[PDB]
Write a structure and sequence with these properties.
It is classed as splicing. This is part of a larger assembly, with 1 copy of chain A, 1 copy of chain B, 2 copies of chain C, 1 copy of chain E and 1 copy of chain F. By secondary structure, chain C is of the alpha+beta class. Chain C has helices at 12-15, 22-32, 34-39, 74-91, 93-96, 121-130, 135-153, 230-241, 276-290, 292-305; strands at 56-57, 106-108, 115-117, 162-165, 183-194, 206-221, 254-260, 265-268, 307-308. Chain C has a domain at 107-308: Pre-mRNA-processing-splicing factor 8 (Prp8), endonuclease domain (tt1808, chain A, Alpha-Beta Complex). The chains are: A alpha/beta, B mainly alpha, C alpha+beta, E mainly alpha, F mainly alpha. Chains in contact: A-B, A-C, A-D, A-E, A-F, B-D, C-D, C-F. Chains C and D meet through loops of C and strand 1 of D. Chain F binds a RNA duplex through helix 1.
RNA sequence: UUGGAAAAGAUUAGCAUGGCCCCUGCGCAAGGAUGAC
RNA sequence: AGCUUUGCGCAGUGGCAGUAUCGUAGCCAAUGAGGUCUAUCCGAGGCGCGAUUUGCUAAUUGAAAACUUCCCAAUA
């Protein structure tokens, strides 16, 4: 399915990041067949219209669009990238690297909170924002 | 325009392309100086590999075919399960496709015998209960009226 | 009821209270080391409260009157719920930020002399809030100016020609590896100097040498629970900086005063001359009693701990 | 709920039906597998448990709707002669006890205000202070305080509801997710909650005034469950030569649970039994309160077979219906020997005379809410006769 | 649009 | 309905007047003392009553 | 005059306007009764 | 010509304001909303959803809480 819009070349990506001025651009780098990307994209579609006011989601295929692999260290099976007014926003998830999510959370509310915090920090002017949760521990007991 | 045309700077090595064994997938000599001699060498080495596989080729291929046939017969792929309905779905007019709406909008009654048996049990219980003399009951309407009159 | 009841078998009103843990709490306090023994693990001594009898916390107060009623977002609610964890971590910092608890990862705080044993972002944020706006440098500056003022007010009484304001690099305040000079005393007559002794060493043995220029150094430290002994720290750092190669002193003879802000302690071990002992003693007393920068540090710590008297 | 799109062509509709069937099979199987994993003790996060609870909730309400429809189709499971036998047993017991039935709460009831205050205090106690209440909780608090301010109008309204009201609103349902087993939790409309609470208080007070429930029916309010265990052990130990085994005597301790006690309660027979002890209007109200709609988020069904247990007076019903089973387990003779004569009743574990205590194989009986503990003592001859049978 | 991604998914799986 | 875009305007520009009734409805003058206080030293009621 | 050096704005409180209502005055619309050789 | 009424708006005094003040794009409504009194009787909006503009001043926190080059020494 994947009703979320897709970008088929680097040109689409680099004018999609600059297209939004009052909304956070979300880019999922990965592959549809990849299950983890499947989980994240299901979560995103579950909240695609909830964050329409202040966020936008685009799906980018690594094979179709491989130019960002070296610059963004796109070596994981899947990454999630946050941009605002041409500036990347780093998120302090507690996983060691603040640039990309690199994992698929099943709860859509966690992603909603993450994108809301990113928007709040980007409109205020901070380039690095703190996640309102710690993902170092999976919280499984 | 490249990816730098956005004016951005960085802050298949993908884990998918890498396997702990065999390392990274993909031949390192996929392209290069390939000519007639290279084709001959590849043909010779492929023939050697086929000859090596000939040791158990018949039984191995027979077992593989039997195993895959039984695996497909036991567990069918979901596309195989839905192919029947997919093909039966072809017989549909294009006029009916525009008609798909949105989501905005003999025989025996099983209840009658249950109600009959329940009423029979109730009648039997009432017949037995009529022998009980000490039961108390008040007049609902009468009591209410008194309540009415009692309101200050 | 959607809340699971553990005391389903009894009612407080009908059966009464069948258990009592008041003596349990008393014995817990005694076994943990008494009230003061427990408080030694905390920042209570860092607040400089004279006594703990009349104090009280402020549960659910925060910086915004706790902002309890609102249309706040779930993430904001999580942050508000995590704020008391920040208060708890700040309270128990002296006993969990020590190297015994966490091995390795000894990273000094930015523009601050505090070392962070273990990556505790909560404590990092709390300490940054406490020491905002270069509070360490301001505290050291205030201490050095106060000591210079005290020495000038008692200049001729101890045969001191004058005092000197040494050019100090900003980092010196939070420079632990090396050190420098803070105050230089110049004399009209020779100062006979004594052998090194602690601030509490009433009896000192006189050294058979004299000097004309005398250095005074001020070192501020944030001691954890295991290393809150100010005298040992002062002695070790005096014997290190004097015989160091990246630390240059104007004279071999001088005094080094170490001040523990986390526990409000102070001690000097350097070389002393007659008449300087009481002057330095009352100077330290008055500077712990009425320093403006130290008072601001105490007030910021109290606000972070939400503890008031 | 039915799903039938009118304009959807039948091939696409059949494909959607097949897809829903396959996804439902996978959904049910994975819900059961996740429940087994969680109950076993596997490490799981919050999302998994939450999802599983939701799935299980949907599955359990599906099964409950199926059970209710099966009861409606297959009629009452209790046979007519079985029901009249139970009724005769109960009436013989109550006549033997000379039990005077509990009258309808009198308008000038001397203790009505106290019972209403107790019910309101119990209802307010259930609302632990969290400062974040939904509309239903704040509405219940408003009704509670309004009734507390003016007890008399609330009492009149409650009596009017007991006399006239027989149709009620939907009862919400939720599941306490104890990892061993889900526990039903029922949310009732606040006015109905107040009426049920007052009725429960009145019923319990009047029953304990008339000694309706025999001593063996626990949980009694005079001993915590540990004290119940202690008294049970001492009563076991205080029987005449209970530990003697020279002549082949044998003591038997049987514990049971009365499986599906709550679910398998016939509302018609329950009403007929309740009319024996309480006023017919009260009995009809109690029975009708059970036959209401149980509603989840999008799911609802008419609970017609089993009792609800979310009702405030359900605590009474279980303690009454269970007593009926006691008369089946003990028999009207032995129970009469254990409960004592109506002149002076016996205690929990006591008999008027030793000769009466050993006159029957059953020495001790103790019923919890649904569990039964029975202590028998047999001689060699009695034990071999029972084994032979 | 959706079919373009569906064909890519089916081919790769 | 989509979740409205979060924003942080100026919390308050003027005070007094109606503003006071607003807080009165929610945020009225409570005891504001000995309710959010802990009494660092001693213990109220039982030790672990909670 | 001279010489020399070079929190992306927070939080709380009060007053007035705006909002609503009685009354007053005025304007306007539509009138009501009535006085004058 | 004097006087007066209803309705309306402007201006002003006084008063009210969370059982208060509105929007409602949702629905119903004089072709009758809602009624336990007066029922062969009364006659208006009602129900759900969603809100409670602008200026000035003061105070707190903070090093700085925002209006257009500042500082140091000496004489006049």
């Amino acid at each position: 399915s994947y009703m979320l819009p897709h970008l088929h070349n680097g040109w689409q990506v680099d004018q999609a990041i600059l297209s939004e001025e009052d909304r956070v651009v979300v880019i999922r780098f990965g592959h549809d067949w990849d299950p983890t990307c499947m989980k994240m994209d299901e979560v995103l579609y579950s909240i695609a219209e909830k964050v329409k006011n202040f966020a936008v989601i685009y799906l980018v295929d690594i094979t179709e669009v491989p130019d960002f692999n070296k610059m963004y260290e796109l070596y994981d099976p899947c990454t999630v990238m946050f941009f605002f007014r041409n500036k990347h926003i780093m998120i302090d998830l507690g996983t060691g690297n603040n640039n990309k999510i690199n994992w698929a959370m099943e709860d859509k509310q966690e992603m909603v909170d993450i994108i809301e915090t990113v928007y709040r920090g980007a409109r205020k002017g901070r380039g690095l924002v703190v996640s309102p949760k710690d993902y170092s521990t999976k919280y499984r007991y | 325009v490249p990816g730098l045309g956005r004016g951005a700077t960085g802050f298949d090595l993908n884990d998918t392309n890498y396997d702990e064994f065999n390392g990274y997938a993909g031949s390192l000599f996929s392209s290069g100086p390939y000519e007639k001699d290279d084709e001959e060498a590849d043909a010779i080495y492929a023939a050697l590999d086929k000859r090596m596989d000939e040791r158990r080729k018949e039984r191995r291929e027979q077992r593989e075919k039997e195993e895959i046939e039984k695996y497909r017969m036991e567990r069918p792929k979901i596309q195989q399960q839905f192919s029947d309905l997919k093909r039966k779905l072809a017989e549909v007019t294009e006029e009916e496709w525009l008609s798909i709406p949105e989501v905005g909008d003999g025989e025996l009654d099983m209840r009658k015998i249950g109600q009959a048996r329940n009423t029979l049990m109730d009648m039997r219980l009432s017949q037995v209960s009529d022998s009980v003399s000490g039961q108390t009951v008040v007049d609902p309407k009468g009591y209410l009226t008194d309540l009415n009159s009692m309101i200050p | 009821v959607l809340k699971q009841n553990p005391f389903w078998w009894t009612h407080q009103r009908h059966d009464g209270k069948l258990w009592n843990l008041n003596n349990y709490r008393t014995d817990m306090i005694q076994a943990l080391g008494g009230v003061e023994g427990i408080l030694e693990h905390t920042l209570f001594k860092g607040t400089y409260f004279p006594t703990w009898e009349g104090l009280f916390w402020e549960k659910a107060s925060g910086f915004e009157e706790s902002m309890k009623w609102k249309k706040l977002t779930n993430a904001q609610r999580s942050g508000l719920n995590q704020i008391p964890n920040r208060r708890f971590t700040l309270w128990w910092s002296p006993t969990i930020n020590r190297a015994n608890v966490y091995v390795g990862f000894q990273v000094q705080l930015d523009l601050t002399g505090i070392f962070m044993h273990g990556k505790i972002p909560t404590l990092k944020i709390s300490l940054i809030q406490i020491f905002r706006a270069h509070l360490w440098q301001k505290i050291h500056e205030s201490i050095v100016m106060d000591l210079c003022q005290v020495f000038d007010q008692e200049l001729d009484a101890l045969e001191i020609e004058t005092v000197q304001k040494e050019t100090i690099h900003p980092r010196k305040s939070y420079k632990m590896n090396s050190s420098c000079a803070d105050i230089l005393l110049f004399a009209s007559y020779k100062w006979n100097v004594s052998r090194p002794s602690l601030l509490a060493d009433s009896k000192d043995v006189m050294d058979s040498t004299t000097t004309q220029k005398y250095w005074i150094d001020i070192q501020l430290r944030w001691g954890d629970y295991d290393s809150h002994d100010i005298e040992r720290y002062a002695r070790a750092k005096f014997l290190d900086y004097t015989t160091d190669n990246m630390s240059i002193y104007p004279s071999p003879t001088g005094v080094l005063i170490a001040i523990d802000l986390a526990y409000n302690l102070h001690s000097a071990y350097g070389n002393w001359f007659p008449g300087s002992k009481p002057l330095i003693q009352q100077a330290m007393a008055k500077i712990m009693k009425a320093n403006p920068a130290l008072y601001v540090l105490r007030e910021r710590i109290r606000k972070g701990l939400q503890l008031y008297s | 709920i039915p799903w039938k799109v009118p304009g959807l062509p039948t091939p696409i509709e059949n494909m959607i039906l097949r897809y829903v069937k396959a996804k439902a099979d996978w959904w049910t199987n994975t819900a059961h597998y996740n429940r087994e994993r969680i109950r076993r003790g596997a490490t799981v996060d919050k999302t998994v448990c939450k999802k599983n609870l939701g799935r299980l909730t949907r599955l359990y309400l599906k099964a409950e709707q199926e059970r209710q429809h099966n009861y409606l189709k297959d009629g009452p499971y209790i046979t007519a002669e079985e029901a009249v036998a139970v009724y005769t047993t109960t009436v013989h017991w109550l006549e033997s006890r000379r039990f005077s039935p509990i009258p309808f709460p009198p308008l000038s009831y001397k203790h009505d205000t106290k019972l209403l205050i107790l019910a309101l205090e119990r209802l307010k106690e259930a609302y632990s202070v969290k400062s974040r209440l939904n509309q239903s909780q704040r509405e219940e608090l408003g009704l509670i305080e309004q009734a507390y301010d003016n007890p008399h109008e609330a009492l009149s309204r409650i009596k009017r509801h007991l006399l006239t009201q027989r149709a009620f609103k939907e009862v919400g349902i939720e599941f306490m997710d104890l990892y061993s087993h889900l526990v039903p939790v029922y949310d009732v409309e606040p006015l109905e909650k107040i009426t049920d609470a007052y009725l429960d208080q009145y019923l319990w007070y009047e029953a304990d005034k008339r000694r309706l429930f025999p001593p063996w029916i626990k949980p009694a309010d005079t001993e915590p469950p540990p004290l119940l265990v202690y008294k049970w052990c001492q009563g076991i130990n205080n029987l005449q030569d209970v530990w003697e085994t020279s002549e082949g005597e044998c003591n038997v301790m049987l514990e049971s649970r009365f499986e599906k006690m709550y679910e398998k309660i016939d509302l018609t027979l329950l009403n007929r039994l309740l009319r024996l002890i309480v006023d017919h209007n009260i009995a009809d109200y109690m029975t009708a309160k059970n036959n209401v709609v149980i509603n989840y988020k999008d799911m609802n069904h008419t609970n017609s077979y089993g009792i609800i247990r979310g009702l405030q007076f359900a605590s009474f019903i279980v303690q009454y219906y269970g007593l009926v089973m006691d008369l089946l387990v003990l028999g009207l003779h032995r129970a009469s020997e254990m409960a004592g004569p109506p002149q002076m009743p016996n205690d929990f574990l006591s008999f008027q005379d030793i000769a009466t205590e050993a006159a029957h194989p059953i020495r001790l009986f103790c019923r919890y809410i649904d569990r039964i503990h029975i202590f028998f003592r047999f001689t060699a001859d009695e034990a071999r006769d029972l084994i032979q049978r | 649009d959706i079919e373009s991604s569906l064909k890519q998914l089916a081919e790769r799986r | 309905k989509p979740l409205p875009a979060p924003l942080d305007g100026q919390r308050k520009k003027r005070g007094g007047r109606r503003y006071r009734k607003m807080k009165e409805r929610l945020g009225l003058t409570e005891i504001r003392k000995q309710a959010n206080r802990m009494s660092f030293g001693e213990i109220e009621e039982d030790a672990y009553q909670e």
